Design a protein around this ligand. Structure first.
Ligand SMILES: Nc1nc2c(ncn2[C@H]2CC[C@@H](COP(=O)(O)OP(=O)(O)OP(=O)(O)O)O2)c(=O)[nH]1
Ligand SMILES: [Mg+2]
Length: 625
DNA sequence: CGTCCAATGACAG
DNA sequence: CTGTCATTG
């Protein structure tokens, strides 16, 4: 019927509690909540190391100690030294968010997060939940959980549906279930060789993501509003520039309204459709195909970018700047990582604009460091190419990549017209899109589409690039056959993605899976290099400088009862690693970042890392030896 | 019938 | 509760 334990009886009950507790290696933790949402109100933690029994930690109801219990908890939760044990919570970064921000406890020990492992098994799996995992892993214990009906986040986060069950209850059941289940998961991960990949690689990534997510990133409303008004200027100015030819009662937002002037005064339609075709006209025709380009681009640049940023911004009083907080995600098929409260990965790229008298705007420039600080960005120079260069062992690609200069500029130079340089960015970007497309086996006609040429001609260009590099095609067909013989591919770490569709009869599913093996292997392995580089960087930064960890630990300082120095994790652009650092340590931080990124793992070529540095989100790059 | 890859979101019935 | 289109990587 029932087994749970409130731990308070005078002293001795709690005393033998901590006395057993201190001794144990593997153990489980979960917390719970009530109301008032940041929040400092947390009912209490709960701990279970196994069995039907479960232990609760409050914040019937007796009394001796008050702050004492909290000291005991702190002492218990970290790694005195030389003593190495692991700890599990359903999700991680937000529970750690709570422990650090709400109660001011910085948990530091070895970590295991069951949902991340769940993902490590099946990257294609959708967002595991407590019921999902206790269903799939710990069968015999499950029915109890159905008394609640909440599965999304932890049992604290499930406070509403649990509200009738809420209390020590949710935290305890979550604790014990998570423990037995994670013993099952760890068992399955060791049943493969993923465990090394799990505990010694990706959990640290979850951690680094967490202290990032506590850091946030800095923002400037003055710049945001300045460029806002600039975009308004181009908005209305392009409105009148547009309706200078005719205009008839127009507004751009309605495509049926566009159909008037579009289908009337031009008449070239090869509901009807919108995008691809008008890009096709963007190449050749001057009379306002591209007016729709600049307009629609401005529109996406404002309604889907300026607004959520300028909305969910918060301020860090500890700084005196306002900052915005993304969310750690993972759970990609490749193993790459994303962020959503907003997603600032996709933040728009700088582009030129006309009113000589031109102008240019950067939506992203609105991102600023703290007043004393500066922004350090570490870019990998064509990394995925270096990985593929490594596995195919095509010596030619190696030698081409060990030499030329932003080879995309060279491709554009010989392509749309011959210019040595003065290649515009969205041209370089289109060419990049195109080329990276070719490598993964873009279909001949679509390639002919983005380049603007005829099918069979483009196909002859594809056959041409096969002819240029044979190691690529070798490795390609080889890995296809291997994914047939296995039914999965494997990223360098030994994490493997399961492709069901490779063995399928239907030719589209078979084709999509064909390219999919390729991209999952190369990009997946890329994201693994990036992860290792991150956790390495932060791991050195941790002990190498004694100040403290992240801006959240400040709020931890206030709730625990100053200068600004360090460098702090901000963002990842997937081949880029994004830091803000006080302008003291910038050189030290730079060498450390460069070093750890290149020291991630050694391979057939060196991975050159461009390190850009400077004020805000736009920058200059040089370092000398 | 749909043949670059991986992400995130508004939009529509 | 699905597939498009916009951007980035
Ligand atoms: N398949 C594909 N991959 C892309 C595309 N854009 C970016 N990527 C991948 C390849 C490398 C990684 C970073 O791309 P970048 O835009 O940085 O290109 P890069 O190779 O890094 O050069 P640079 O960073 O100097 O622009 O993301 C694209 O349009 N298609
Ligand atoms: Mg790059």
């Amino acid at each position: 019927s029932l087994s749970i334990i409130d731990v308070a009886s005078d002293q001795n009950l709690f005393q033998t509690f901590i006395k057993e507790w201190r001794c144990k290696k593997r153990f489980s933790i979960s917390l719970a909540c009530e109301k008032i949402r940041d929040d400092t109100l947390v009912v209490g933690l709960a701990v279970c190391w196994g069995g039907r029994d479960a232990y609760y930690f409050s914040l019937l109801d007796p009394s001796l100690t008050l702050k004492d219990r909290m000291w005991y908890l702190q002492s218990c939760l970290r790694k005195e030294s030389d003593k190495e044990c692991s700890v599990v919570i359903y999700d991680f970064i937000q529970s750690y968010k709570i422990l650090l921000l709400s109660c001011g406890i910085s948990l530091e020990q070895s970590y295991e997060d069951p949902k991340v492992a769940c993902w490590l098994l099946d990257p294609d799996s959708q967002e595991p939940t407590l019921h999902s995992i206790v269903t799939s892993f710990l069968p015999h214990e499950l029915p109890l959980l159905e008394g609640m009906e909440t599965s999304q986040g932890i049992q604290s986060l499930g406070l509403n549906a649990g509200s009738e069950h809420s209390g020590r209850y949710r935290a305890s059941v979550e604790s014990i279930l998570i423990f037995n289940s994670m013993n099952q998961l760890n068992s399955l991960l060791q049943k493969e060789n993923l465990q090394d990949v799990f505990r010694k690689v990706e959990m640290p990534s979850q951690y680094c993501l967490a202290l990032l997510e506590l850091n946030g990133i800095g923002f400037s409303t003055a710049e945001c509003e300045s460029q806002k008004h600039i975009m308004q200027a181009k908005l209305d100015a392009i409105e009148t520039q547009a309706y200078q030819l005719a205009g008839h009662s127009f507004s751009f937002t309605s495509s049926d309204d566009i159909a008037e002037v579009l289908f009337l005064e031009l008449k070239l339609p090869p509901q009807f459709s919108t995008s691809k075709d008008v890009l096709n006209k963007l190449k050749a025709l001057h009379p306002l195909p591209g007016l729709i380009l600049e307009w629609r681009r401005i529109t996406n640049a404002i309604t889907k970018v300026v607004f959520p940023l300028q909305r969910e911004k918060c301020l860090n009083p500890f700084l005196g700047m306002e900052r915005i907080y993304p969310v750690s995600q993972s759970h990609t098929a490749t193993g790459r990582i994303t962020f959503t409260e907003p997603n600032i990965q996709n933040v728009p790229r700088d582009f030129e604009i006309k009113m000589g008298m031109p102008f240019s705007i950067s939506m992203r420039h609105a991102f600023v460091p703290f007043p004393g600080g500066s922004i350090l960005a570490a870019d990998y120079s064509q990394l995925e190419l270096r990985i593929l260069a490594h596995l195919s062992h095509d010596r030619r690609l190696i030698q081409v990549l060990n030499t030329g200069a932003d080879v995309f500029r060279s491709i554009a130079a010989e392509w749309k017209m011959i210019e040595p340089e003065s290649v515009g960015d969205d041209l370089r970007q289109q060419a990049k899109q195109i080329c990276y497309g070719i490598i993964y086996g873009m279909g001949a006609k679509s390639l002919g589409e983005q380049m603007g040429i005829k099918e069979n001609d483009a196909a002859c260009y594809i056959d041409s690039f096969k002819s240029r590099y044979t190691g690529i095609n070798q490795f390609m067909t080889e890995t296809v056959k291997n994914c047939k013989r296995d039914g999965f591919v494997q990223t360098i770490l030994g994490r493997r993605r399961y492709l069901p569709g490779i063995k399928d009869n239907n030719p589209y599913r078979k084709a999509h899976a064909e390219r999919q093996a390729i991209n999952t292997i190369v990009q997946g392995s890329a994201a693994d290099i990036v992860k290792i580089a991150t956790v390495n960087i932060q791991k050195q930064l941790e002990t190498f400088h004694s100040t403290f960890k992240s801006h959240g630990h400040r709020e931890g300082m206030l709730q625990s009862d100053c200068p600004i120095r360090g460098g702090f994790f901000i963002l990842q652009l997937h081949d880029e690693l994004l830091y803000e650092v006080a302008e003291e340590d910038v050189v030290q931080v730079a060498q450390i970042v460069k070093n750890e990124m290149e020291s991630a793992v050694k391979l057939s070529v060196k991975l050159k890392v461009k390190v850009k540095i400077g004020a805000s989100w736009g920058e200059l790059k040089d370092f000398d030896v």
